[PDB]
Design a protein around this ligand. Structure first.
Ligand SMILES: CC(C)c1noc(=O)[nH]1
Ligand SMILES: [Mn+2]
Ligand SMILES: [Mn+2]
Lengths: 137, 137
């Protein structure tokens, strides 16, 4: 049986800007780097950056909705988003829902999100105002 | 301060075959489904499947190395991988070895992996046989 997410690997076009983004701007811990990759952690998350000649810097209009959301407390949310805005990090979507989300891009166009709240909270909100066709199990 | 992964959202071209893959084949827990998405969990992982007509199915040879690995125990690894092969799940290939892993594709061409071992175990293995240019912090 599967027990959780083991690691998330992102393909990157250039290692140095990606390490700077994840380690210095986002504050993740850098454990190791080599000529074609790096290992970082963010809480329990193991993140691998893999240098890939096939990776293109992809505008948000040209990629689908696949995205990766990081946990943050409500108290820290606004100052963290403001840090990203000062650094010139692009936003790919406005939050149109209740609850706190900030949608931002990494240097290669991977779609990222800051989100406050758990699955249990989302399910409780949906039980009150379900999406079209929603069934619970 | 970021504290880990909040959720993983995958864009899918057809909801029902994707839900069946993650729930029936991979054994993830289905919490809710609606006309354009589903919420599942795998241990601590919150997985969202989102119906996206912009999702294309690309051969693994022409998509980049971005991929998502799930944890499995040493005792369950070989029999789970054998079950995926017997179900006809397609494989893909990574450029380097990262330990005990099985690489497979989901119905929309997302690159998945079964992996045995933690980041700490990977770092210890790399100390004994490092990648080219490796530095440990
Ligand atoms: C599709 C939408 C309701 C959604 N829920 O979590 C996401 O990441 N997107
Ligand atoms: Mn999201
Ligand atoms: Mn991997």
């Amino acid at each position: 049986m599967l027990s959780g997410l083991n690691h998330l690997t992102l393909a990157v076009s250039q290692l140095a800007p990606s390490v700077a983004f994840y380690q210095q701007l986002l504050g993740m811990t850098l454990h190791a780097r080599w000529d074609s990759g790096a290992y970082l952690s963010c809480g329990d998350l193991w993140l691998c950056l893999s240098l890939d000649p096939q990776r293109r810097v992809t505008p948000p209009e040209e990629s689908d909705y696949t995205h990766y959301a990081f946990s943050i407390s409500e108290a820290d949310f606004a100052s963290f988003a403001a840090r990203l805005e000062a650094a010139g990090v692009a936003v790919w979507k406005l939050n149109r829902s209740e609850g706190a989300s900030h949608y931002f891009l990494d240097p290669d166009g991977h779609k990222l999100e800051l989100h406050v709240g758990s699955l249990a909270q989302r399910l409780a909100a949906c039980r009150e105002q379900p999406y079209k066709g929603m069934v619970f199990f």
